[PDB]
Design a protein around this ligand. Structure first.
Ligand SMILES: Nc1ncnc2c1ncn2[C@@H]1O[C@H](COP(=O)(O)OP(=O)(O)O)[C@@H](O)[C@H]1O
Ligand SMILES: Nc1ncnc2c1ncn2[C@@H]1O[C@H](COP(=O)(O)OP(=O)(O)O)[C@@H](O)[C@H]1O
Ligand SMILES: Nc1ncnc2c1ncn2[C@H]1C[C@H](O)[C@@H](CO)O1
Ligand SMILES: Nc1ncnc2c1ncn2[C@H]1C[C@H](O)[C@@H](CO)O1
Lengths: 221, 241
């Protein structure tokens, strides 16, 4: 099973795009972010209201529900010829973008962070080899595109998110995936291929061509 | 084929003492310490390069933090306490007792203590809200459907001391973080272990526990008074298995 992680900032349109991709082939399946599991255990609203209190509790639940659902979809599903499983984001995104960001903003203290890294390290050392990515698709949209789209989706918990939060997360994604300067202690990720895609335009325009590029990206793998 | 024996009892019941002495009777016996030292000095792993120039910094005390503000730090504590426990138990399960004839691996507390005794109590005491309590049980259960089976106990030895003995032995031990624990906290935990291990009425999400053999030992006495009898009882206990 070839595993692809779909990465991008909030409301760039990763659920939109991946849902579109699933249909191209029967050999293609998707692992969504468990946002409904998060809305009703509402830990998402809690952390966004009180980031200094609920940040670590969120990252734990977040990453845990992601590991669970990524593993459930390999342990079952697909006799498929050349199967691909696309992940809405990854364990690497949780830790080196969001959790790292919250730390950098002081919504996690040194203790919380250290515990979070030690849990991430262990949690991932049990599997890791099992959920290792073969490729990344970085959906690239500006902070402002992403602020507009948050308003379009209309989710109640995210309406307060300031642009400056999004710029931050945007800088982390560019550093990790475009400049490739961010260091994870998973050194295979340095030899993982990355398809960057501009998705700033309205999907009425340019969009469908992107999907043709993806069929391509997954020929070389 | 390693028999796993969990060693349970309240705080300062004397579990560390009894089982680290008890293990000298056999080379086929080894003990997995409760990783308390990791909880009072929290550290994550260092980069392969960073560690040649950087010291492993002394972390925070998430054990003190939890005592000082349980409604803030109970969830974070339970989560790490359980992770570190599992990690050590599994590591010694894969690690020790190669050339061993009748191996017994004695655990200091279990993953079930942390959930059904300690966390259960912080919930009940309102130190963890429903979300925290629900997130935690969801993690615990998952963790148990993986590495469990590999962790199943063959027995439990319950070292029974009065809340008052525990409190005394807390002062004796002199552990800084625990010095302001009131008798009432120890009372509640005593009660939880009674229901689990003596009366066996406490309702669990793991059925085999209802069947697991339990040896109850009274360790209120000065160590040397009952030592002879306790070792007798224990050995007559491992043979039933
Ligand atoms: N290219 C696009 N053009 C116009 N709207 C888009 C585009 N991509 C996504 N959207 C819309 O913006 C919102 C956020 O997209 P979504 O796929 O939910 O993002 P994510 O899952 O990455 O948070 C949704 O309303 C979606 O319909
Ligand atoms: N039977 C005993 N009589 C007098 N002191 C004891 C006895 N058993 C243990 N102690 C002391 O009580 C303290 C707590 O013991 P410890 O073995 O750390 O308990 P636990 O491991 O259950 O927390 C230590 O000072 C230990 O030396
Ligand atoms: N690992 C994470 N840490 C903090 N926040 C996260 C994380 N993953 C997803 N989110 C947020 C982004 C959107 O608000 C919403 C949709 O995924 O959930
Ligand atoms: N699972 C737990 N939950 C809350 N506290 C715990 C737990 N395990 C140990 N302790 C505390 C009690 C003693 O201070 C000391 C002995 O390990 O650490």
């Amino acid at each position: 099973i070839k595993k692809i992680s779909i990465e991008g900032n909030i409301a760039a349109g990763k659920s939109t795009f991946v849902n579109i991709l699933k249909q191209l082939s029967e050999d293609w399946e998707v692992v969504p972010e468990p946002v409904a599991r998060w809305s009703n255990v509402n830990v998402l609203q809690m952390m966004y209201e009180k980031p200094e209190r609920w940040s670590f509790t969120f990252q734990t639940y977040a990453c845990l529900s992601r590991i669970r659902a990524q593993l459930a979809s390999l342990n079952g599903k697909l006799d498929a010829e050349k199967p691909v499983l696309f992940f809405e984001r990854s364990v690497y995104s949780d830790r080196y973008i969001f959790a790292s960001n919250l730390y950098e903003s002081e919504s996690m203290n040194e203790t919380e962070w250290t515990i979070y890294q030690d849990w991430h390290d262990w949690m991932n050392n049990q599997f890791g080899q099992s959920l290792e990515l073969d490729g990344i698709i970085y959906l690239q949209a500006t902070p402002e595109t992403c602020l507009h789209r948050i308003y379009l989706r209309g989710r109640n918990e995210e309406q307060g998110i300031p642009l400056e939060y999004l710029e931050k997360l945007h800088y982390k994604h560019e550093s990790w995936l475009l400049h490739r300067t961010l260091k994870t202690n998973f050194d295979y990720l340095q030899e993982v291929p990355i398809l960057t895609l501009d998705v700033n335009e309205d999907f009425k325009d340019k969009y469908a061509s992107l999907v043709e590029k993806v069929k391509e990206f997954l020929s070389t793998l």
